[PDB]
A paper describes a structure:
For these reasons, we used H2O2 soaking in combination with the Trp161Phe MnSOD variant to characterize the inhibited complex. To visualize the atomic identity of the product-inhibited complex and the corresponding active site protonation states, a cryocooled neutron structure of perdeuterated Trp161Phe MnSOD soaked with deuterium peroxide (D2O2) was solved at 2.30 Å resolution. For chain B of the D2O2-soaked neutron structure, two dioxygen species are found within the active site. One of the dioxygen species is singly-protonated and bound directly to the metal ion, replacing the position of WAT1, and forming a SSHB with Gln143 that is in the neutral form. In the same active site, D2O2 is observed binding tightly between an ionic Tyr34 and neutral His30. While the D2O2 binding site between His30 and Tyr34 was predicted, the neutron structure is the first experimental evidence for this binding. For chain A of the D2O2-soaked neutron structure, the active site is reduced, but a dioxygen ligand is not present, and Gln143 is deprotonated. Our radiation-free neutron diffraction suggests that product inhibition in human MnSOD is a five-coordinate complex with a singly-protonated dioxygen ligand displacing the metal-bound solvent molecule. Although sterically crowded, this complex prohibits catalysis during its lifetime by blocking the fast back-and-forth proton transfer between WAT1 and Gln143 during PCET redox cycling. Our XAS measurements and DFT simulations support the interpretation that the Mn ion is divalent and the singly-protonated dioxygen species is HO2−.
The Mn ion is bound by inner-sphere residues His26, His74, His163, Asp159, and a solvent molecule denoted as WAT1.
Numbering used by the authors:
A (entry chain A), B (entry chain A), C (entry chain B), D (entry chain B): 0 to 198
């Protein structure tokens, strides 16, 4: 059993003019391909260390596992979080939760934009579900540290703010990218992930 | 007394084809300009917090101070570490120290390349001087964490591996950028910084 | 501007048998005294560094400033959070908020206990108020990182889980210390801090 | 694969008066026992997670694996680094290396003392061997982060500066513990570890 690079669920150019085809093609076919590959290498190294009881080797592998494993986790969610069919606002129970927990949809967007723009260096902004509290929650995570693994929050919507996610098109102006990405958020998918959290 | 953006000591296109003019112009006129400005804002906020004894506010300012202050420190060194007159190998006492501490110049390049490529997320690779030990030392630093402030090592040569340092030209292939940058290292400047360490 | 060691609101033995007198005496007159003395020294070095535009020195001083500054913040709150007259349950709107946000007083105790017992190495567990969400929130902080300065949450109740907070009495058994400290929680103070957070 | 708590090379009181019997007994039979028990439990969860390709669980387990795994690594070395027959100075090639790399035995002691006293929060000071540079090197590590797993340096001599390593005897005065522990350094073991690092 090995991890595999999921195909992108749309054409490389499908999110233009919000995120261009050169970015989507590099982001998926180079960056994500490399996370999956490095993750499988690291998992096998870890299995050997575990079989040997080599704790030094397990701990030495931790940064590569978190970075590439987190990369695999985060980008697998990210591709489904975007869509040419996206944009606009969610409906039904996700919308009501957003209004209840953040005041309004636009207040929510301000909070997730602020968490995303606020990342210094590489990282991600997330809308998550706090299972213990039974409500929504915003967090930012450094580098590829994944949401559920490092906070327990269930990921609903992630925004990649590594410079490779935007730089070719938006250069240093990360806020321009955040403004554009709202046009391609796949609220159908974020709703699916939210409803899976509730029972 | 305020910090100021140092002019680049050469034309934006001067390091082509190793680092292109679009990168140098954004890197200096957008990214470094923003570090200096945010650093001065943060220093003034810190002075007010200090005058008030507001320790919460001092600690809340720490990430912006380290990121933008480190950014100012690191990029101020970086521009002088590059030159259209660069490339090749150092001479005299710096060369002898490199051979003594790392075996050879090429062994040194391998070690600094490995530290630079090994940064996961944003960061820097450094050749530094360990004043206590009286010899050279390689370290990598995360995000804009500056060498001397976080390790005590005196900076001689830094390699920026934030994606903005290379992505427009080299895309995901960070090793291609590291290979190119050796052609523009200003060994005259690294020698000046080294000789200043010795007395 | 000159921070001072606050007088304790009771004598060192007032929280016995739950926290013994020797711990309280060492905790206040040695550990907290050192946070204050070290904070003042570090603040003076920061004034000198700001005056000189020495950003390296500012950043080098950060770990000591957060550790001792955070120590001053945290322990100043901690003393007021405990009382010989404490224990039992809170009343009124705080009790209502606890039932609403954590399900019950007992479940809140389990959650703050688990966050405090869960710190690996030195740190703190906090009950805090989230100003933006208008509700209570539990978080853990590493070392002396203070809650408001690093998370924006307003501190209501803190539990020190540095080993010096419990070791002389409870040795390695941090869960016995957590069980005992509920007997001396100054809910009157936590209620004051909570009511201050609302208009 | 089943890690075990190593028997101590001496009885719990053998390092008195420098480290008293109660500390040694708690340190080995409670703290180290817990690192081993927690490491084994965490390793079993990692085997389950690897078998399922559950990367979230792998990453969630990392803090416990490094803390308890690192605890196992560090404390297993620590016990062998101390002896009732210890103290004094090393001989031969280790003494030569110490004089060469740190100037003198006394200056080496000051440097390892300063690194150990300098840890804010929990951690370790290490004398290590740098395989690539072919010389000795001092470093500090936070919490239980182990030296070789996080730095590649080979451990020669470790000093535990978690508060449980000294508090019952020395209370807050970590410098008195550092002065006392030189009396029980097992230089025969440190010499064996050093000679193993060379061909
Ligand atoms: Mn990405
Ligand atoms: Mn840069
Ligand atoms: Mn304390
Ligand atoms: Mn220990």
């Amino acid at each position: 059993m090995k991890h595999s690079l999921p195909d992108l669920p749309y054409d490389y150019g499908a999110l233009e003019p919000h995120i261009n085809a050169q970015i989507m093609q590099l982001h998926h076919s180079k960056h994500h391909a490399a996370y999956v590959n490095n993750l499988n290498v690291t998992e096998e190294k870890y299995q050997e260390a575990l079989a040997k009881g080599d704790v030094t080797a397990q701990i030495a592998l931790q940064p590569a596992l978190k970075f590439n494993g987190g990369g695999h986790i985060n980008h697998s969610i990210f591709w489904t979080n975007l869509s040419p069919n996206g944009g606009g606002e969610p409906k039904g129970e996700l919308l009501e939760a957003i209004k209840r927990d953040f005041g309004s949809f636009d207040k929510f967007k301000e909070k997730l934009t602020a968490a995303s723009v606020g990342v210094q260096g590489s990282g991600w902004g997330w809308l998550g579900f706090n299972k213990e509290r039974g409500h929504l929650q915003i967090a930012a995570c450094p580098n590829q540290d994944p949401l559920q693994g490092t906070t327990g929050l269930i990921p609903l919507l992630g925004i990649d703010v590594f410079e490779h996610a935007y730089y070719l098109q938006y250069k240093n102006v990360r806020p321009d990218y955040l403004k554009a990405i709202w046009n391609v958020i796949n609220w159908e998918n974020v709703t699916e992930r939210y409803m899976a959290c509730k029972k």
